[PDB]
Amino acid sequence: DAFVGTWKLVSSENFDDYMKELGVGFATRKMGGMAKPNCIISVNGDVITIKTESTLKNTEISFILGQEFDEVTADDRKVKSTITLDGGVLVQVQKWDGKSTTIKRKREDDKLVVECVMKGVTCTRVYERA
Numbered sequence: 001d002a003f004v005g006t007w008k009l010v011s012s013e014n015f016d017d018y019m020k021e022l023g024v025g026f027a028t029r030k031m032g033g034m035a036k037p038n039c040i041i042s043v044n045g046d047v048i049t050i051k052t053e054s055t056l057k058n059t060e061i062s063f064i065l066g067q068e069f070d071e072v073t074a075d076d077r078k079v080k081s082t083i084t085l086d087g088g089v090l091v092q093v094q095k096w097d098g099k100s101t102t103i104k105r106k107r108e109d110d111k112l113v114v115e116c117v118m119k120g121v122t123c124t125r126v127y128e129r130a
């Protein structure tokens with residue numbers, strides 16, 4: 001839709017703080033911070049697929065909006081995720097061990113803007129078309 005495409009990360013703010021708040025260890029934060037992933041988003045009726053591809057770690061989710069699913073995240077958390085569409089924004093919540101983090105994906109101009117919140121920490125990642 002607005003989201004379908006192959007996207008390449010062009011900027012990141014506060015991603016190390018974000019990962020540290022998730023409880024990601026130093027080695028994994030090191031690798032993750034200097035990754036420059038692509039994000040490939042596709043849709044086939046009700047099912048949305050989000051692939052993230054990077055030199056050191058690939059991940060893939062497929063989901064239906066409003067249907068909770070189990071996910072293993074890039075840092076190996078086992079979480080329950082639910083994604084919904086709210087005012088044109090794809091809102092993802094991950095829940096695990098009584099904690100949650102939210103990931104909002106929005107289209108702004110040319111770009112795919114991803115805002116990641118964990119407790120007091122807010123990280124913004126910007127992708128442009130590949």
Ligand SMILES: O=C(N[C@H]1CCCC[C@H]1C(=O)O)c1ccc(Cl)c(Cl)c1
Pocket residue numbers: 031032033035036037052054056057058059073074103114116125
């Ligand atoms: O799961 C990732 N990223 C997602 C989920 C949480 C942060 C926002 C979003 C993003 O990066 O836009 C992920 C996957 C592989 C790598 Cl190698 C990296 Cl570095 C990150």
